[PDB]
Amino acid sequence: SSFSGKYQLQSQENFEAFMKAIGLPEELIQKGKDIKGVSEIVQNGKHFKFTITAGSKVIQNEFTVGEEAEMETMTGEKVKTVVQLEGDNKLVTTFKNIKSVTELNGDIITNTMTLGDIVFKRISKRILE
Amino acid sequence: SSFSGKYQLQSQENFEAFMKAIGLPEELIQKGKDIKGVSEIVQNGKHFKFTITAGSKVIQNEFTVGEEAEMETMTGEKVKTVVQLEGDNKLVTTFKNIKSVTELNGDIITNTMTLGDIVFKRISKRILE
Numbered sequence A, B: 001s002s003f004s005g006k007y008q009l010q011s012q013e014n015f016e017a018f019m020k021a022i023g024l025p026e027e028l029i030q031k032g033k034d035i036k037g038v039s040e041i042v043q044n045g046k047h048f049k050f051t052i053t054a055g056s057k058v059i060q061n062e063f064t065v066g067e068e069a070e071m072e073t074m075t076g077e078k079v080k081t082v083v084q085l086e087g088d089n090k091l092v093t094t095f096k097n098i099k100s101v102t103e104l105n106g107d108i109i110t111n112t113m114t115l116g117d118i119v120f121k122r123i124s125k126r127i128l129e
């Protein structure tokens, strides 16, 4: 129903392989690969604000689903794309050669990004406030 | 007694002036100044683990009070210093020309970094799980 909350990373797969594939420096990969931080989502109807802890970087993006928006990626590149809401619990978008699906089930968010034959998956749990 | 917990930044003063004085790139100052992230502290006796969201960077440091420790600063530089316990609710250290005081008051942490005539102050509030 609502994505709003603070979410702590529980596990992830293929962080190193994905970050290498997009061109992150090996130094940033090693610094960030073991960080289990907190991301925050604020949802207001179709409007979303994301404060994402991704490795050693914090990325803050904001978008209304269905509208074109500029979003900062891991590389510092700003891509223009549209994020769609599928049902009430799935955010879907594509940018460059990456497909991203953010799914909320109960208190768990599973983020799956696919780049070629690499599936980068992040599993995070809502902090119960 | 215990600093352990997750803390969300509530307010801060003089971020830009402090970051300019330590030589942070201007582009990192502008994108980091409005981020209100979550920092985590794990305390075990005199041993501390810090996962700090500072602007658009995540910094992870460890140390034991009273023992010389190597710590990453906001610029990525590593410094060797000693962190002291003043009372039971203040952590205090000096490195380069900066004095840092971390004070716990119930659910509020206040961090005061002083550099010459600039006082950079962060107030964070414990996330109640």
Ligand SMILES: CCCCCCCCCCCCCCCC(=O)O
Residues within 6 Å of the ligand: A007, A009, A038, A039, A052, A053, A054, A059, A071, A072, A073, A074, A100, A102, A109, A111, A122, A123, A124
């Ligand atoms: C699509 C632009 C964002 C680029 C950042 C990529 C890093 C992984 C993104 C996952 C964020 C999804 C929110 C759930 C919480 C989390 O996994 O931190």
Ligand SMILES: CCCCCCCCCCCCCCCC(=O)O
Residues within 6 Å of the ligand: B007, B009, B038, B039, B052, B053, B054, B059, B071, B072, B073, B074, B100, B102, B109, B111, B122, B123, B124
């Ligand atoms: C001693 C250098 C550590 C890193 C320097 C980054 C500047 C911000 C330091 C604030 C750390 C205090 C932790 C309490 C919670 C917080 O304010 O995030």
